[PDB]
Design a protein around this ligand. Sequence first.
Ligand code: HBY
Lengths: 556, 430
Amino acid sequence: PISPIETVPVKLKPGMDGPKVKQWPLTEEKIKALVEICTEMEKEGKISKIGPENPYNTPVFAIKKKDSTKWRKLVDFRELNKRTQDFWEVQLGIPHPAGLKKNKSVTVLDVGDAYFSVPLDEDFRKYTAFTIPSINNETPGIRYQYNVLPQGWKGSPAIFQSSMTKILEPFKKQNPDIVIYQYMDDLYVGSDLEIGQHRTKIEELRQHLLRWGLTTPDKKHQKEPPFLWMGYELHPDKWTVQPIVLPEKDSWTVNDIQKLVGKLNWASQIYPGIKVRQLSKLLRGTKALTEVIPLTEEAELELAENREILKEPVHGVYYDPSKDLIAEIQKQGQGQWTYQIYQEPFKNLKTGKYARMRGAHTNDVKQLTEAVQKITTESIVIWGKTPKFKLPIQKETWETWWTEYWQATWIPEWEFVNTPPLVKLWYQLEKEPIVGAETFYVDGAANRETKLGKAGYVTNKGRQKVVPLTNTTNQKTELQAIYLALQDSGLEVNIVTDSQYALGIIQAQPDKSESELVNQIIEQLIKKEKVYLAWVPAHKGIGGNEQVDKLVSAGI
Amino acid sequence: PISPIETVPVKLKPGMDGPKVKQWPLTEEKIKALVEICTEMEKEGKISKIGPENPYNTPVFAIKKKDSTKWRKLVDFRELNKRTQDFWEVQLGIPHPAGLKKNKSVTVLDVGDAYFSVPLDEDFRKYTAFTIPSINNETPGIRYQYNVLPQGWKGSPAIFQSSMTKILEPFKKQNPDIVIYQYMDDLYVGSDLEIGQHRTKIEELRQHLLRWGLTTPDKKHQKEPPFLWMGYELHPDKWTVQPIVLPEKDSWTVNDIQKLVGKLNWASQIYPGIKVRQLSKLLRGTKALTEVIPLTEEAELELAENREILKEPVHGVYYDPSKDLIAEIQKQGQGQWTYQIYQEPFKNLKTGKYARMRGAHTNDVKQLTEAVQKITTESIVIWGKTPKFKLPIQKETWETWWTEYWQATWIPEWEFVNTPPLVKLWYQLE
Ligand SMILES: COc1ccc2c(c1)N(C(=O)OC(C)C)[C@@H](CSC)C(=S)N2
């Protein structure tokens, strides 16, 4: 049944014309199966035979699924989709179960083939044209043309949604309180009316729709209470994804690890603590899906650690605005952090994770704040609100940090919390130069081509030292020189550098870097009493720099 | 009321289709507020909901421009401007009165509402499409297109230029010694007469305007400690400075000399020919730090002579209108921040220092946003162009909190700095 609703005007991308594909015939039983549908599709008015005029073709596939009983066809408008104008984004994102409201009764209606009920613009029909020659191609005039929204076509979804939005409006107002949502071929209706008062209203909606032209052949609520919406498992007061199973192999490929990382990533929503750190760390190699990446003990100790979690069911609660929002975060180490957002304690609303990847060595605090951000962001995306923050940070360590750092930030409403993995700044590089402490003029360099470097220092009291290095970088040398300077010094020290780069990392105050050298330096910094770092230019610089590099150079 | 007035055909540069821009997710209150606004504007005939046939989009925001009571719907037209107006920067472009800067006192006032009566080209309206975001994607986005002239848009005042000029003439005639620039929904008015006389002269224009049309310069009111009353009152009679400032005392120890030389070495990239060598000579001997070493002979020649090149900078004072301005601010001491506008690195056209009283609301973001806003007006007045900003702040961070303290009608282009520069000194430039 065709819907009377007004059809939106559709044109082709400027100066373009529609498809002309006079397809290669098939005298198969398929050619009769075609008209079996057509000369019964036109009866329902979905299509219409058009005259031998200008209307140009689009390929028909007479196929049918593996013994589908009902042999159903489908025209593929691949070339038409190319020609048609651009519409508004349908899949502008999906709603997240994390910020929905508690509903007494929810219903879902099947809006498939409802695309087929909504009509198509008259000054456009001609483009969806198609012909189909039978016996000996001596009867070509079996030329049909669509009147509704063609399955698979470009406009089809964006228009349908619009038409439905249009259609639901009068109904959404005769009873404002009941909310409706729609997507693809599903209609998630919902309200807080007693089952009977509720189930009647549904049949009311059904008749309304049916009064236009759309159809819901399913007598009532046909979709079983537990729903598989975009994988998610939906129940009246809880949510998850029941089918969350990842197989164990022994010699897998990049192809398979990608799906793993992704299924794991998916699970991060409710399952607290899931880490994909080492799990993804390996995929970093130049992509070739069929190449087998051998697992590391870390990658092994991570999956099973995850399997442990994923083995048992854990659900998610729903949103209730009347109650305030709160989020808590905590560190897992190696850059991994994890969060949970709740309202009622241990009434898990949603969870997730952040990890500072690729861009190595950074401060712990910058991470925590980078974390807050993802959350802040994702909250607005969901609840349109920003949560109260429960985070392991001493107020003074934050005060000093933003008062120290160069880049700008703002962490809203937050409160302290204790958990062993506490975030704090272990050291601070001295602001002013330490008076009694020895001055280590330092320098480092390497023969970029040969990779053989020499690192070292000289002190105010002529305490020199130079140590060789091979298969290292010019920068590795620069840092090695500082570590050296730290080692051989007392509790308080003043160190001066030639490289601006070197300076940066130390001032950045990181911790727990995978880089073996940086850790060593970090530990030295923590062990120290006071450390004043200074920076002077590399080449034209003096102050000792006009000797410390003549001391560390040899080879070319 | 649908006005039968004739419109001007708006066609952009071919090979450039309309803005398909992602709408930032907004706060609940902010959304309801936009809905309020739009619903009334819809009745007023101003804007109209559209269908799927319109794929274009533009970001909308919610501001508290007045004095933070009612919500102002701000539209991010940045793209459309690019997409149309850079060819209508010539076609019907409003020229800049190059002395507005040399002027003694200027005032800015909303003239946005003016464009609302006037209609927008039928075949172009589609490009003004914007979307009000539904929370958690609950419902489909709310889509309208402007039917009249858009506030944020740069093409709007261009069209109204004719109408504006006319509505200005009586004031322009009786008052010649007063300049009037129109960059967007704002009118900049400059005078060389003092405050008292000037405010009464402004009220005059406001009155004049309001007389000559429902063009309403929104109400005068106070705020901060030493109580103000009407319009944003700038004073470009002092829009110049030398924020360099070397240590007039701290030049005794090794470190002081060490640190000194580096800033001087960076200054070399800007002010050419700076003698640092003779001064850096009394360092070479690897001597201890904190050692109070008195300054030598030939080394003093490198200071005093190059300390006067720091108080007299002239070179490529030139400004290319074919190129764009780039302003980069950097976080300094608690309350202070420092900006630098240039078009080609080191070639610094304007260099200033911003600083909001540390105490009122010691917020980090507010400060920056405030800065940018000011830094920008500083540009318009002096060049009639908004700079691309190199922001020392996290992308995601800004995209969240900017719209909060944004009391401007316009929105400049921006970028984010993810790198710490040695550039930060006691008083720094670029
Ligand atoms: C067991 O299914 C549900 C349980 C709670 C909710 C929903 C479905 N919601 C929905 O939009 O359907 C899909 C897209 C999730 C709506 C009520 S249906 C309008 C809300 S506010 N909370």
